[PDB]
Amino acid sequence: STAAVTGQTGLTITYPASATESAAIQGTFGNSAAIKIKNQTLTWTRTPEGAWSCATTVEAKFKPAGCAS
Amino acid sequence: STAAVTGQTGLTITYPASATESAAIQGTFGNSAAIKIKNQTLTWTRTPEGAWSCATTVEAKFKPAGCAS
Amino acid sequence: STAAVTGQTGLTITYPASATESAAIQGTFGNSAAIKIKNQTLTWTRTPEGAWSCATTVEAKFKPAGCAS
Amino acid sequence: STAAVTGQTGLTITYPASATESAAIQGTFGNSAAIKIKNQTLTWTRTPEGAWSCATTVEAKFKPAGCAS
Amino acid sequence: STAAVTGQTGLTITYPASATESAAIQGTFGNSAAIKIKNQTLTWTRTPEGAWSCATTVEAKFKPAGCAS
Amino acid sequence: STAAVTGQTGLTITYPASATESAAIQGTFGNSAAIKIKNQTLTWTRTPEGAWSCATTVEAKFKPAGCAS
Amino acid sequence: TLIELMIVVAIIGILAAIAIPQYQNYIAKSQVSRVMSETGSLKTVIETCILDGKTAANCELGWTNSNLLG
Amino acid sequence: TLIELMIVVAIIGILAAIAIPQYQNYIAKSQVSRVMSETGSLKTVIETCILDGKTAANCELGWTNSNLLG
Amino acid sequence: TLIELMIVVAIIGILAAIAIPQYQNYIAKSQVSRVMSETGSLKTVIETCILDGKTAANCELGWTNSNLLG
Q1: Which of B54, D12, D49, F38 is the most exposed place for a label (fewest CB within 10 A)?
Q2: What does the alpha-carbon distance between residue B25 and residue H69 come to, in Å, rounded to a whole number?
């Protein structure tokens, strides 16, 4: 289970290769998740400066207070 | 090893051959360094009079108090 | 974001300019915070000798043991 | 860089002109020094007999064992 | 404050004086500590040769791996 | 204690006796260490020229950046 | 109502099935780094002994017992 | 009850949304400082070589490889 | 499971309330010691100038600027 190849297909990692790229950890719902959010995604993105933030494509009703961006 | 050739590619030395030129020890980051500073340099320069000073090309927030230009 | 000006309106820094004054890191609550504690503040104060302490204007019911001064 | 005119303003040299005066090398803190000791001073004084000693106006807890006078 | 007298009643320092006794830093729990361990002690002992060790009178299951003596 | 015999079973010193031998400081895990790395070793080797290097037999993901060779 | 209790049970099951990362790597790396530092602290005394010309028995180590056997 | 589980979920959400203090600065500063020390350690041998009059090829360094390329 | 979250919050509060030592003393002492060494390095040249009989303007100092003003 490395950054290049994760254990499962639902988790993807964009690893920067230069000082001007931003890292990303993306997870796509599925399997035991609800039908309404079956194919949505939640991502943690890290800017080159080193700042982490969260985002998601799920509807605003289901969005937690920490990822309403 | 020697000033003319060292055992590391990331360390270079400019050795004076006359009495009117300066000496320099330069090190380029890499390998186990952070990606953000993966290619910057830090140099110790010595004037012909015999004064040593430090400089670096990393961002200001990474510079220690001793190498502030 | 620097000590002089931060990137958030809810966080302020009182930076000492002489050896006889204290430093402060003050943070107000807002948006995602509860309505009850909406406009309260929590501050970290550093005496000129170098001792850090915590204080808050919230009720003692919500005060953690660390900042129960 | 001579005794009469030092390189920087933070260093002062009191050079004797007769056989009865005492020499002094005084350094005032500042620049990259701590704010608490921003304007203190450390002096090396030499009696006309040729004895060197050190004095400092910083707080007692910051004094090294050498200049505890 | 000082080794002779400290600002907290729960912290005591035993300071060597005759170059043949051990030094001790003892702390008795209380205040915000749990009721079960309210009056136990944790001590650091330094032998005259200069070796530091930790001991505590708290129950075995609460002891960290470092002070399991 | 001494280089010939130490007070700990898990620490061994290979002390050179001539100008062509290399020094070694070896430590074997155990006691409070994790079960996975219970019987691994970490060694510091000094060549007769006077160069120090680190090595370890622990798994790759547990190695720090310093002892990655 | 029964559906509320069933939803509560489902939430409990969801929370209980959280993915726990392999925390063994964290502790192992920390312990290996600590042992690295402790063993590297002896390089000063070993080098001074070697450069002084002392024998193995005459080299005094200031070693103290480590809770990690290394 | 359902409200207790929702409070637990809310607390989990608050805990997961903690602010990261942007630790890159500390690591970068420490690495730059250690490179500073390593490169400044060569000033002694360089100055002795220069004041002795040796050529570039005749100056013997005590340099060893550094995990940071600098 | 609410009690587990409350215990986690209590542990977080305990960790956040750690006593910070007055680190100003260490930094101040180190800076004062460094300034002591730099200023004492000039004693050699000052003594040679005095014992040679040179004037203040004729005494050459090999002084280099120090990031600490002292």
Answers
A1: D49
A2: 13
